[PDB]
């Protein structure tokens, strides 16, 4: 695997979104991984619906959090519509899949990366965008405005984000707090320090869709 990976540069990543005041990060995270794998496998770059997972994943808790792996499982079971056909509202509603016509994409399964392993995480990113969790509740993570983030932060993971690249010393993360946070909505988190949890517990729980 390359020294540098940036899926944004490769055309596999859509504009940064803002989840607003709804703890819909799980759905935002899952959707980056779907936009990424459809681009990789078809060549087409589309945006898909976070709102649809929010409404329809009843394993998850709407605006109160949820599971990127449950959302990924849903897109493998049923599929997902374009963002355009099912736009974000930042509130949980009725699942309206049914009323929007056929799904626009569907995957062939979900896999989990071996936890607590930087190497296994980096080999995944080299292949496609991956969904990861980290502790976002610390003031330092919240007030970040740029540079390689080294903490401080614990490992009480509470936020789902998408890893879209890496370099020699960082893992490149796409957040869902709009442009106004980090480096135009992105964070570079330090890697390669020998910490097994990863900085802000980044190697805790990482999944990605499979598409044949």
Swiss-Prot record:
Catalytic activity: Hydrolysis of proteins with broad specificity for peptide bonds, but preference for an amino acid bearing a large hydrophobic side chain at the P2 position. Does not accept Val in P1'
EC number: 3.4.22.2
Binding residue positions for leupeptin: 25
Superkingdom of the organism of origin: Eukaryota
Enzyme class, first EC level, given as a word: hydrolase
pH-related activity note: Optimum pH is 4.
Keyword annotations from UniProtKB, A to Z: Allergen, Disulfide bond, Hydrolase, Protease, Signal, Thiol protease, Zymogen
Amino acids binding E64: 25
Activity regulation text: Repressed by the active-site-directed cysteine protease inhibitor E64 (L-trans-epoxysuccinyl-leucylamide-(4-guanido)-butane) produced by Aspergillus japonicus. Inhibited by the inhibitor of cysteine proteases from Trypanosoma brucei (TbICP, rhodesain) and Colocasia esculenta cv. Kaohsiung no. 1 (CeCPI, tarocystatin). Repressed by leupeptin, a peptidic cysteine, serine and threonine protease inhibitor.
Protein family: Belongs to the peptidase C1 family.
Function: Cysteine proteinase with a high level of diversity in substrate specificity, an amino acid bearing a large hydrophobic side chain at the P2 position is preferred.
Full protein name: Papain
Residues included from the entire protein: 134 to 345 of 345
